[PDB]
């Protein structure tokens, strides 16, 4: 009994940087912690509210998702979803209403990928999104010209504008 305690690692040790290609085409180095979902890491960095959309699930709209392109090597770390459940209904709805034609075989949602040590120096890109609407407040006209941050939105998710 009484095995050796493992001291925790410092943040410097557990910070991984990901290169994220934005809509305008600039590359940003997004430092991220291992064990965090990609959506949260992207939100904290300071991307605009236009780059993210609520998860279109019965009870998941509070989460903010993004359309991302993942390199073939990191497909393993994406999370499996049961078709006969409602998580699949969420994903199908987001593909039908947000991604649409801009879909590619590499297209995935940030919430379903969790950052790990093996994802260091990974290059991801924001995938193009079509205009979408849920409520007048929660919508995307199609113009990526607002300079706010998704972090600065306190309201958790859509309900009634």
């Amino acid at each position: 009994d009484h095995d050796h305690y493992t001291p925790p690692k410092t943040v410097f040790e557990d910070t991984i940087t990901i290169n994220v290609l934005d809509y305008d085409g600039k590359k940003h180095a997004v430092k991220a912690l291992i064990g965090t979902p990609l959506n949260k890491a992207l939100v904290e960095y300071g991307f605009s509210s236009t780059y993210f959309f609520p998860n279109m699930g019965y009870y998941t709209q509070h989460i903010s998702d993004a359309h991302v392109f993942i390199p073939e090597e990191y497909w393993k770390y994406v999370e499996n979803v049961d078709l006969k459940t409602d998580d699949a209904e969420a994903i199908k709805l987001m593909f039908k209403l947000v991604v649409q034609d801009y879909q590619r075989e590499t297209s995935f949602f940030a919430s379903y990928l969790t950052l790990n040590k093996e994802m260091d120096n990974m290059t991801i890109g924001f995938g193009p999104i079509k205009p979408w609407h849920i409520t007048p407040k929660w919508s995307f006209n199609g113009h990526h010209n607002v300079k706010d941050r998704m972090f600065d939105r306190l309201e958790t998710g859509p309900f009634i504008e």
Binding site: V78, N80, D82, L83, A88, I91, D101
Partner: protein
């Protein structure tokens, strides 16, 4: 760690199946226009229909419910081919 439900299927195969819903989406106005027009004409015609037995009506409702196809179903399976 906690016990979790087993998900049938491989991760990439399920995601590929989900990605077949990401197709050009038509506007719903086109469907609505036709439904409104035909529905108005249908309501006008319904006043002249013969009186049907309740049993026949219920059976027709059942058949219509069974034969109704959800819009998502056609959307996922639609192929632009012969």
């Amino acid at each position: 760690d906690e016990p979790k439900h087993q998900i049938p299927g491989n991760a990439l195969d399920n995601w590929a199946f989900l990605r077949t819903y990401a197709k050009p989406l038509p506007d719903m106005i086109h469907y609505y226009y036709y439904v409104y027009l035909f529905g108005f004409f249908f309501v006008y015609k319904v006043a002249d229909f013969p009186e049907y037995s309740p049993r026949v009506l219920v059976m027709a409702a059942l058949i219509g419910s069974l034969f109704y196809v959800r819009r998502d179903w056609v959307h996922r399976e639609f192929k632009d081919s012969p």
